[PDB]
Structure formats: structure tokens, C-alpha cells
Automatic annotation (TrEMBL), chain B:
It comes from the Bacteria. Produces ATP from ADP in the presence of a proton gradient across the membrane. The catalytic sites are hosted primarily by the beta subunits. Produces ATP from ADP in the presence of a sodium ion gradient across the membrane. The beta chain is the catalytic subunit. It catalyses: 4 Na(+)(in) + ATP + H2O = 4 Na(+)(out) + ADP + phosphate + H(+); ATP + H2O + 4 H(+)(in) = ADP + phosphate + 5 H(+)(out). It comes from Bacillus sp. (strain PS3). This is ATP synthase subunit beta. One of its GO terms (cellular component) is proton-transporting ATP synthase complex. ADP binds at residues 161-166, 341. Mg(2+) 2 binds at residues 165, 194.
Length: 478, 470, 478
């Protein structure tokens, strides 16, 4: 009777309780007779509280529990790119096993205060509205908050696609999403060719609460390897709201007392410990980076809720999506009223900075001119010109699905919009105008595009104006 | 050994004790058959399911029926597997309770029939379909405005006396006729007399010849009121997998399924979640919905009725359900009062399939045009009801004319309503209905009276009827 | 081995724990040492949680506890008609004992879904408002929800009395009512002469909680006997809310885990098990029926509480009573705006069906324009006509107490009002007009009354119009 190997006592709702295991450490990995991994949380006087990471149907009281001798670990390596794995690091797409050699602990200290560094490089999200009003740096932790069915996932896929050539790895972590949705997302990513530099970690709804709770930590742990080696990483958590729900269920099962809205008081620490690893290292540490874009699901557009407050406190800034404008098919409203990028602004290149101010002012004016000002024709002062120009801006701010616009063409079209060149063409032809504009730049604007791509600054205003005017002459109004 | 004895009875929750090292696994089923040994006893026949292991070789189970008459000391027989339910063509045209025993009087299923476990892991990642498909139902409103996805979940709102049963019957009949796919109805927490009336209606209409029904009455314990949905789903999964054909699955009420889950969790004794619901509400819903998918050789599409508690769309149960839905159709009293069927709302109803990447740019544009025209008509109605059509301009008069024509054309005849009308019904293909709607939008048929757009379906029948009255 | 005997361990608040009783069944009947009855609820590994069914002050720890071997059962038979009985089956009104020779368990399975038939016969309550707008058919379980002091017991008593001529047998179950109110109700029923076909089951507020918990089940079990003998039964409970309160108190005392509002987990199961035994049997079973009219009281019209919500979800429809209207003076103050009856339509005779719809639409139209009556600036032809019609209809719908109206006279007056024949009578004399019309119809309308009685169909419209014209001519305006 040697007690370096445990024995089960109680099993229920995914939580076991083994007896023995004298030399076990808190957080070690234990594997049952079935082959299911397990977490060891509480080391009481006699028994050990075990959390089961998988199907607990087959584990019966009286089974034997073994030790592995390793703290919570995840396989990491270059071979992981292009695969789909569960949070434990096992492939779920078939295609053979994975050849990994190194691992990293799930819980690791975040970089210290001296190690970090102020972020100064842009992250081209390929969306005109975002890159104009709410720019994102390469070390930021920006929240994207909105209701359901508001194209948030769409934004995620465009952001991942646009990095085709910016030498940046990416990771998409889906929490509580439907398996069919995840499969369609993987298929469209493969179709657009992004699987050469991405990794997908999935945790569907059918999977247990421990896996739902552990997935984001696994994702960021995978990221940290490249981050410390010296590359740049982008990580997109899907539903921190569902992760919080899974943790709440786990807590209430472990008999801990709840707090506000039945949430245990540990939820803020749970979120902060995760998000705080996203930082831009100094040049001495290696020059790496890691940016995150978590989402949150709200009800009826209510920011007051506990989880939105916690995440908005942790994050650098938020991007709000308005549900009402989603009905009109537009890319959901990037509401400039609540959207803010406190860290950003220093990330934007000067070329786009030169115009972002006038876009912000114009959008503020047009949005401030409500339906009361829209009523009637008594508004005969410059308000009519303001309304027409604002309508031009709103029409040009729309985008298609999975259509990343390079920053050069973004700044070109936005300058043409600002400098009055679009004040004459009716608002119904702006989209075709943009399309032919891109074609014209592709066929002739090589000098302008090269200059912007190389110097990150506007070209000669006169030359840009004359090229735009030439396109205007060659354009035909419907 | 298989023999075990009872040691604790607390209402619907019962406890068992087994010889050490022979404990049944979780979710298994325990059969209790007893004969009254004397007059101070009562014959008992009860089936329990195992939930928790409390240690000390004891097991905490819940009951599927009344626990009265139980005695501490009765033998308990372990089946070794979760609840088993007959599957195959024998299930069609029958009514079962949660345990797979027929409720009607047609007779007992032979014991040799193949049976399947209730609980089952969800289909793996590999087996899923790689693309989205559209389910062509043949009902003009739904395949125009709010299309149904092969393998998706569809929410259905509406109260009583609105034609919900008629819509269900028409969907079942059309799907059977045009796809060779059976359908299964699962009455979670239904009113008994309403269920009986639905059964009689279906039998009279003759739809029941290609369906199988599972009924969980409101007088049953929470265990049965939870497991009825799962047994219906495992009835449908056999047809999805072995037969390789598209199937329809209905659920009478899912909010009651969640409520039964909460009650059984409270009985088990876990601390309640936000509004008193069980902590495991999300994972229970996930383990239910995640088996309704579309694989490489079949599909299951689900039509689920939802009742909102206290009319609060942010309640945890409606929020959790809406996290899964793909489309929504709303049934309206006003459209019911007007001579319009199936009285589905053309504005409140919505879908995820309404995108050019799925249905096509032409279909999308036609749908958007119809939506905005109907909205404009709704806006003008309020002023017109007090001012008369005189103040309406020529363009708005044309808009009102076209909107009335469209709104009347949205109606359809049904194969079901033949028993009361004599109209042979219609099955309108998607291409035909979109072409007809675009042509009506173009104004080609504005000279016809509006009543010629009443109950035809295809666009040719419109002109034939109009010629019929001349 | 103690098998049919046991000793008490703890006492208090009507809850006793006994040691032994190893061969007891859950829900059995247990007799104490001094003769007090008891039912065993919880069967633990060493103690049997017993609930005491009487004055428990006489039980000391160490008392002898005996076994009976009988599942809970109530006396039943034809001798119970015209007696007041507590749920245990004993008379509380003197007048000697009963002669019940057969008993049945209080817990029986409800009739199966294959033994029921669609409801198709009317239940004549004699109240014009409900009989015209929210009809009740035999075999339907309809809920009457209202606030305190809103004539709920009044409506119950009228609908009990009105069944004098028909074949119905009515059972009145008093839960938590004051003994004074119960005595007055019994006396008024005797004075009206309804005691020859009714049974009263009483559980006063002074009685211990288990009796309150058992009263509805005793009533239903008493009714099921006449169910299966082939008659028609009507049963009324006053306080499902108070029964739920008693059960909650019992469960909390027995240390069962609590749920919402401290209610035990199976309160919905209790209510559904109670109410689902009311149905309309098929012809193979004899053709019996049992309709239930439970009452629920809401404080300040809060129908959002747990018990009202559950009962609403269980039952087939609501009848709303309005405190404000009752205070204003409207009797019975039926809020026809919110009341609904899903069974209705098929529950009415053809004569009433041909007339109900027009009156329903008239009330619906008038209800929304009640604010127009403050000013005469109303558009006269439509809006003022609607106001006059609505006032006349409401004044017709008012009624006095303990005077049921036969269906023929009800449909007569409803037809007269609907066909516009009353637009001339002043709104302050309609009650006198109605009484005089009933008198005149009793005088010479016997032919129309007989035709309606024997055919359930409207009489000849020409003769009806002639008769009402004659009465209108002979009437005098005050």
C-alpha cells in the first residue's frame, strides 16, 4: 500500500476528490485510468480536489489516479501553425499528430514594469473606420464590445486576413461558439489563404466548463513563445463573457460564496491575470510584442453590467458597435461617441494623422445634426453643406465583407473625400467611384502608392490633386 | 454484483447502495420491480438515473415517476447503460413517453428491436459540413424573407390561436413530400389536452403517417421533463446517420426544459446561479443543441417554440437560447384577423441567411426592396387612416398600391387546409417566388384587382384567377 | 428488531423525528401514542421525518410510534354530500358521522393523454360578462386571479349556486379562510338551497400546516370518484398561494434545500400534479368531466410573483379582477382587456356564438378611447357613437350579487344591445330597462325562451324584433 498513486472517492459534475497522492503539487497534471487529464486544485489534509478536463462519464469511484510530475503545460512550437487544437494542445482536425518539442506553463508571471515599453507602431486592421477613428497599436489591449449578431466575428476575420504580408503571427481563440460556425470560419480562412500564419484554438459549447475556462490561458501561453523569441503576435479571444460564465459555474460548484450577480469576487483577478500578459517588451528583452482584441457580449446595449465594467477598466480602450445600424446592412456602427483609443494616436502614421482630425470633426457634426435638423427645408445656412458632406463621409465609411483595404488606398480615398472632390457626385455613386478609383490607382498611381508605402507620409498635395482630378474627368456619373 | 439496495428517500430524489467496486457509471439507469409480499406493501415499478457518486459505495439518483410506497431495503437492478430507446421505422406513427414505451394503444414494440443510448458525445469536428446550405421549404414568406439553413436552429414566437399547429403540419408535409425526410415532434412540458388535440389533428390530416411523437406531460417529474428532449433527439439521430436523409425536429417548449433543469439542480442541492437558475444551465443547453448539426451525409434542422418569461429579452434563459438561434419568425394577431395566412410577420421576422454570399445578390435585393416598401406603407397607414387617400401624392399612391399587392401576395394556400376549403394547395419554389415578386415590384401586374393576389402561390395562378373573374 | 414500532427523538413545530420504523413506506400513515395522526415524508438512513397532523403539544420525546400500513387515503362516497369535512375525512359540523364505505389514495396518476376528448360542452356560470367574453367549458381548468377585496369569493358562490338545475356536482375547498367566512358561506349556500348537491372541505388558518398542504389533494381525490362513476364535477380552491406557503414551511422545517423565494424545488411539480387531474374523459371511460377554478391573490396586482407565474403557466387562461374598478363600483369588475380563455369559442352554444363577436369588438374599440370622454370636441359620428355604445355596454355588463341569469335571457339582452336597439334609452336607466325586459320576457317571451332552450340557436329574427319593439314601445323613460 504505497500512497504515491491516488484513489477516487467522490465524482460529480466534473469535480472528483482523490485520496492519497502525498507528493502531488498544487497545479500538477494527473491522468486517470481512462486517459483523461486532470487538474489538482485543493490539497486538503487527507484528500485532493481534482478538476476533470474532459468527459467525466467514464470515471468511476474506485479508479486509480496517476501522477505526471509536470505542472500545467501546453506544447508549443513552429509546427503548430496552421492547425486546430483543443486547449490541451491535441489536434482535432485529423491530419496526423503534431510534432512539438517544448512546452510552457499555463500560469506565468507577466513582464515587469521595467521590461515594458511605450507602443509606437501601427497595426493595420484593414478597416477604414477603425484605422481612421480608433487606431490600434502593436502592444495595446483593445476591447470590442457590442450585442449579438453585430458582425464582431466578421471584424475578427478581416483583422486576421489583413496580416497576410505584415510578418505577424496570429491566433484565433473561440469560446463557446458553435462547431459549425468554427468550421465555416476555418474554411473561409483557408480559402483566403491565411492558414500559413494562424493557429485556431476551439472550445465549443458541448465541451466542459474547465476547458471553456482554460482555453484563453492556453492561447496566450502559445503566443508568449513567439513573443519572447522576438516576433510580433496578435491574439483574438472570442467570448470573455462565456469564459466568465464557465468560471462562475465552476466556482458555484466548488461551494464558494458568490458576490454581485452571483459572480465570485475573483472574476476581476481572473480577467486581469489573463490580459496583463499583453505588452510590448523593451529592446533589451528582445523587442517582441503581443496585442489582444477580446470581445464582450452585452444585453440591450447596456455598458453598466459588471463584466463590461471590469473589462473596460482593464483595457486600454473600447470600440462600441451599435445594433440599430446593423439592420441597414452597414458594417455595424463604429460609434465615435463611445469609441476611444487612449493608447492609440501615437501609432497612426503621419500620413493618416493629417486627416483623422477632420474626419472626427465632420462625423461629430453630422451625428450632432439629428432628425430635428433633418426635418424641413428651413436649414438653408451651411447646415445643408454639412449634411451633404457628412452623408458623403457616412457612405464612404462602409465596407464589404472580407475586403481589406491597404492603408495607402485608405488615405488616398479619405483625402479625396475631405478635399471637396466628392461634394458634387451624388451619394449613390460613391461606392462605384471608390472602386474605379482603386482601379485607376492600380493602373497609374504607382508613384503615389510607392511613396506612401516607403515614407509613411503624404505625397505632393498638388500631384495628388491633379491625379484625382484626372480620375474625375475620366469618371462617368450614372 | 448487480444487486443493490435503497437507503434514503427524499421526495423525487432517491439514494442507493451497492457492493464495493461494482458501482454503476454516471447517467446509467436503475430498474426497480417489486411485488407486494403482503398487504402492507404496494407493487412498485420505477426507473431511476444515476447522477452523483457520494462515496462510501452509495449513489445519488433521481426518479422518473412517483416514489410513493418505497421502502428502505428494496433490491435495485442495474442495467449497465443509459436509457435505451427503440429506433428505426417502427417508431414512425407512434407516441412514446420518455422511456420509449408507447403511450397509445397500438401495442408494445418487440424486445429484439435495436435500441440506442440517450446520452452521446457530440459529433466530432471532422464530420461537420464545410459550407452553408438553404432549406427550401416551399412557403413563400419564409423562403423569401427569413430562409432556413440546413442544420440550423430556428426560433418560433407566437401565442395561442394563431395557426402555429397549422404551420407545423404544413412544414412537415412539405418537407416529407419534397425531400423524403421524416420529422419528429417532442412535446417538452406540454399541456395534456393541447397535446391530445394536436395528435387528433395530425391523425385526421394524415401527416402522422410519416412522423414520430414523444410526449412529456406537465405532471411528470423533472427527470422525465428533462430527458424527453434528449430522447427525441436520439430518435432523430438514427435517421440522420443510418438513412442519410434530412430530418426535422420540433421542440414544444425549451424554456420549460431549462426550468426543469433548474428544479432538478435545486433538488440536488447546488447553489443557484444568477436568477436562481442552475449553475450548469449553459453547459446543459450546449450539450443539447450541439447535436443538432449538419454532417457530410445528413442534417438535422430544429424548429423550437420559445416563451419569454415576464416579457424580458435579457432574462438568462432567453439570452442563452438566443445565443444559438439562426433565424426568427413571428406570428401576429393582426395578420391573423386579416384574411392572411400563415399570418407570419414580414418585418419582425429575420434571418442570418439574408446575405448575398448565401442566397444571391438578386434575391437579397428583391427582399430588401420588399422590406422597405412594406415599411413605407406601414408609415403611411397612420396618416392615411385619418386623412384619406386624397392627400397622398401619385408616387405614394403607387407605393401603397404595390404594397397592398405584395402584402396580399405573401399569403398562400396549404395542402393542410384542403379538408376545409378544397384548394389543392401549392408548393412554390424559391426561384419562382422571387421572380414573381420582382415582376410584381416592376409594376407589370398593377392593373389586376388586389384580390387576384390572395391565395394562389405561383405567379401564373394569379393571372389565371384574374382571368377567371375577368 | 423493531419493525412496526419506533421511538420519538425530536419534537417541535409539528415536525417529529422517530428512530426505527424500518419497514415504513414514504407517504404512509403513522399513528402516535395518544391518537394523533401523522404522515412520514423523509426516509433517512436512521431517522424518519414525520409530519404531525393535529395538536402536537401533547407529544413528548420518548413517545411510542405505531405503523398502519395504509398509504394516505380519504373517505369518499355519496354520503359526503351536504357536509363540512376537514381533509382527513372527519365532520366538523356535528350532525353525526359519515357512512363512507370506500376510500382511495390521495395520490393517483392523472388520466392518460389517450383517454381525453376535446372539451365541447358549456359551463353556465350565470355571470353575463364572463359567460359572454371568457367562456368556460366542462373539462377546462380556468384560473381566476385578483387582488384582495375584489369579489373573488362572490363569483365563486354565484357560479356554485347557478348549477342548481344542471347535472353538475360542485365541491368547494376552503384553504386558509377564516372560520367565520366559512360559516357564513355555508349558511348562505344552505339558504339558497345548494347544500343538497355540494361538499365543503375546510382547512382554517389555525390548523397545522400539513392539513393546509393536504386540502386540495383531498378535494380532488373526492371528486375523482364521481369522475369515474360517470357524472360531472366542478371543484374550486381558494388559496393555492396559501397551500404553497404551507408546503414551503413544511419543507423548510424538514431541512430541505431551498430555491427561489425559499420555496422548495418541487413546488411546480406539486401544483402541476394537483391540477393535471382535471380533464374531460373520453367516451370509453364514461364521459365524466371535472373543471377547476383555483383562486390566486396578488398584492397590488403583482402577477410577477413566483406562485402566480407558475399557476398562470399551468392553467388554461386567466380571469382578471380590477381593484380600481371594484372600488369605482363596477360589479363584478371583470377586466376583459387582459382576460383570456384558450378553450373559448368551442365552449359556447351557437346562439351565444352568433352574438358574442360583435359585442367583443365593440368593447375592444371602446376600451382604448376612454380618455376621449372628458371633452365633447370628439368627432361625433364615429367616436361619440363608440363612447355611447361603450357606456351602454358597460352599464349592461354590471350585475348584482347572488342573482344568476339564465343563458336565454343573457343572449336576449346581448342581442338587443348589439343590434343598436338601446341607443335611445338614457344610460342611467339601462338597469331598470333590463329588469323590466326580463319581467316582460317572463310575461310573454316564453316561446322564444323555449326555442332557445331546446335548440341552442337564435329564434326568428323577425319575431324577436317585433317583441323587442313592443317592449320598447311599452317602456317609459325616466
Amino acid at each position: 500500500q504505497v500512497s504515491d498513486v491516488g484513489t477516487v472517492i467522490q465524482v460529480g459534475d466534473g469535480i472528483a476528490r482523490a485520496h492519497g497522492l502525498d507528493n502531488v503539487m498544487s497545479g500538477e497534471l494527473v491522468e486517470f485510468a481512462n486517459g483523461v487529464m486532470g487538474m489538482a486544485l485543493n490539497l486538503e489534509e487527507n484528500n485532493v480536489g481534482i478538476v476533470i478536463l474532459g468527459p467525466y462519464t467514464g470515471i468511476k469511484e474506485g479508479d486509480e489516479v496517476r501522477r505526471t510530475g509536470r505542472i500545467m503545460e501546453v506544447p508549443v512550437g513552429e509546427a503548430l501553425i496552421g492547425r486546430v487544437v483543443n486547449p490541451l494542445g491535441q489536434p482535432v482536425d485529423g491530419l496526423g499528430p503534431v510534432e512539438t518539442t517544448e512546452t510552457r506553463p499555463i500560469e506565468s508571471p507577466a513582464p515587469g514594469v521595467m521590461d515594458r515599453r511605450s507602443v509606437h507602431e501601427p497595426l493595420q486592421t484593414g478597416i477604414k473606420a477603425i484605422d481612421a477613428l480608433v487606431p490600434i497599436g502593436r502592444g495595446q489591449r483593445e476591447l470590442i464590445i457590442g450585442d449579438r449578431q453585430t458582425g464582431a466575428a466578421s471584424v475578427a476575420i478581416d483583422t486576421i486576413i489583413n496580416q497576410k504580408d505584415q510578418n505577424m503571427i496570429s491566433i484565433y481563440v473561440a469560446i463557446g461558439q458553435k462547431e459549425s460556425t468554427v468550421r465555416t470560419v476555418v474554411e473561409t480562412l483557408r480559402k483566403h489563404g491565411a492558414l500559413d500564419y494562424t493557429i485556431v484554438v476551439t472550445a465549443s459549447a458541448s465541451q466542459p466548463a474547465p476547458l471553456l475556462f482554460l482555453a484563453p490561458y492556453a492561447g496566450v501561453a502559445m503566443g508568449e513563445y513567439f513573443m519572447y523569441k522576438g516576433k510580433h503576435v496578435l491574439v483574438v479571444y472570442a467570448a470573455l463573457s462565456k469564459q466568465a460564465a464557465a468560471y462562475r459555474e465552476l466556482s458555484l460548484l466548488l461551494r464558494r460564496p458568490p458576490g454581485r450577480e452571483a459572480y465570485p469576487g475573483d472574476i476581476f483577478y481572473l480577467h486581469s491575470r489573463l490580459l496583463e500578459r499583453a505588452a510590448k517588451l523593451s529592446d533589451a528583452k528582445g523587442g517582441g510584442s503581443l496585442t489582444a482584441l477580446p470581445f464582450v457580449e452585452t444585453q440591450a446595449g447596456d455598458i453598466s453590467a459588471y463584466i463590461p465594467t471590469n473589462v473596460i477598466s482593464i483595457t486600454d480602450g473600447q470600440i462600441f458597435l451599435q445594433s440599430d445600424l446593423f439592420f441597414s446592412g452597414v458594417r455595424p456602427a463604429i460609434n465615435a461617441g463611445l469609441s476611444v483609443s487612449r493608447v492609440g494616436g501615437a501609432a497612426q502614421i503621419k500620413a493618416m494623422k493629417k486627416v483623422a482630425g477632420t474626419l472626427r470633426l465632420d462625423l461629430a457634426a453630422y451625428r450632432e445634426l439629428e432628425a430635428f435638423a433633418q426635418f424641413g427645408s428651413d436649414l438653408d445656412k451651411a447646415t445643408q453643406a454639412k449634411l451633404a458632406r457628412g452623408a458623403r463621409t457616412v457612405e464612404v465609411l462602409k465596407q464589404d465583407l472580407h475586403q481589406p483595404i491597404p492603408v495607402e488606398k485608405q488615405v488616398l480615398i479619405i483625402y479625396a473625400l475631405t478635399r471637396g472632390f466628392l461634394d458634387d457626385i451624388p451619394v449613390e455613386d460613391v461606392r462605384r467611384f471608390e472602386k474605379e478609383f482603386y482601379l485607376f490607382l492600380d493602373q497609374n498611381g504607382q508613384h503615389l502608392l510607392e511613396h506612401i508605402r516607403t515614407t509613411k507620409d503624404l505625397p505632393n498635395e498638388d500631384d495628388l490633386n491633379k491625379a484625382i482630378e484626372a480620375f474625375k474627368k475620366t469618371f462617368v456619373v450614372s | 454484483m448487480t444487486r443493490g439496495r435503497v437507503i434514503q428517500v427524499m421526495g423525487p430524489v432517491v439514494d442507493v447502495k451497492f457492493e464495493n467496486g461494482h458501482l454503476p457509471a454516471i447517467y446509467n439507469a436503475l430498474k426497480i420491480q417489486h411485488k407486494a409480499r403482503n398487504e402492507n406493501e404496494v407493487d412498485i415499478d420505477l426507473t431511476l438515473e444515476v447522477a452523483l457518486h457520494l462515496g462510501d459505495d452509495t449513489v445519488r439518483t433521481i426518479a422518473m415517476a412517483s416514489t410513493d410506497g418505497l421502502i428502505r431495503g428494496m433490491e435495485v437492478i442495474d442495467t449497465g447503460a443509459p436509457i435505451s430507446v427503440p429506433v428505426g421505422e417502427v417508431t414512425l406513427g407512434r407516441v412514446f413517453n420518455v422511456l420509449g414505451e408507447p403511450i397509445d394503444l397500438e401495442g408494445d414494440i418487440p424486445a429484439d428491436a435495436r435500441r440506442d443510448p440517450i446520452h452521446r458525445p457530440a459529433p466530432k469536428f471532422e464530420e461537420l459540413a464545410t459550407e452553408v446550405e438553404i432549406l427550401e421549404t416551399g412557403i413563400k414568406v419564409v423562403d423569401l424573407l427569413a430562409p432556413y439553413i440546413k442544420g440550423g436552429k430556428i426560433g418560433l414566437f407566437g401565442g395561442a390561436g394563431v395557426g402555429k399547429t397549422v404551420l407545423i403540419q404544413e412544414l412537415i408535409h412539405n418537407i416529407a413530400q419534397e425531400h423524403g425526410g421524416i420529422s419528429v415532434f417532442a412535446g417538452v412540458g406540454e399541456r395534456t389536452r393541447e397535446g391530445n388535440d394536436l395528435y387528433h389533428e395530425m391523425k385526421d390530416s394524415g401527416v402522422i403517417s410519416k412522423t414520430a411523437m414523444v410526449f412529456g406531460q406537465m405532471n411528470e417529474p423533472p427527470g422525465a421533463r428533462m430527458r424527453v428532449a434528449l430522447t427525441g433527439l436520439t430518435m432523430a439521430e438514427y435517421f440522420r446517420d443510418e438513412q442519410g436523409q434530412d430530418v426535422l425536429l420540433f421542440i414544444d417548449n425549451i424554456f420549460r426544459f431549462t426550468q426543469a433543469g433548474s428544479e432538478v439542480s435545486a433538488l440536488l442541492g447546488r447553489m443557484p446561479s444568477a436568477v436562481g437558475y442552475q449553475p450548469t444551465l449553459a453547459t446543459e443547453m450546449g450539450q443539447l443543441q450541439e447535436r443538432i448539426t449538419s454532417t457530410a451525409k445528413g442534417s438535422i434542422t430544429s424548429i423550437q417554440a420559445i416563451y419569454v418569461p415576464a416579457d424580458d429579452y435579457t432574462d438568462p434563459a432567453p439570452a442563452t437560447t438566443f445565443s444559438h438561434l439562426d433565424a426568427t419568425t413571428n406570428l401576429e394577431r393582426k395578420l391573423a384577423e386579416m384574411g392572411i395566412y400563415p399570418a407570419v410577420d414580414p418585418l419582425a421576422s429575420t434571418s442570418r441567411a439574408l446575405a448575398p454570399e448565401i442566397v444571391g445578390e438578386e434575391h437579397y435585393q428583391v427582399a430588401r426592396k420588399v422590406q422597405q416598401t412594406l415599411q413605407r406603407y406601414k408609415e403611411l397607414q397612420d396618416i392615411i387612416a385619418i386623412l384619406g387617400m386624397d392627400e397622398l401624392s401619385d408616387e405614394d399612391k403607387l407605393v401603397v398600391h404595390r404594397a397592398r399587392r405584395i402584402q396580399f401576395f405573401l399569403s398562400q394556400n396549404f395542402h393542410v387546409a384542403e379538408q376545409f376549403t378544397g384548394q389543392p394547395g401549392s408548393y412554390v419554389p424559391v426561384k419562382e417566388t422571387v421572380r414573381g415578386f420582382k415582376e410584381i415590384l416592376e409594376g407589370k401586374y398593377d392593373h389586376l384587382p388586389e384580390d387576384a393576389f390572395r391565395l394562389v402561390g405561383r405567379i401564373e395562378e394569379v393571372v389565371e384567377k384574374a382571368k377567371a373573374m375577368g
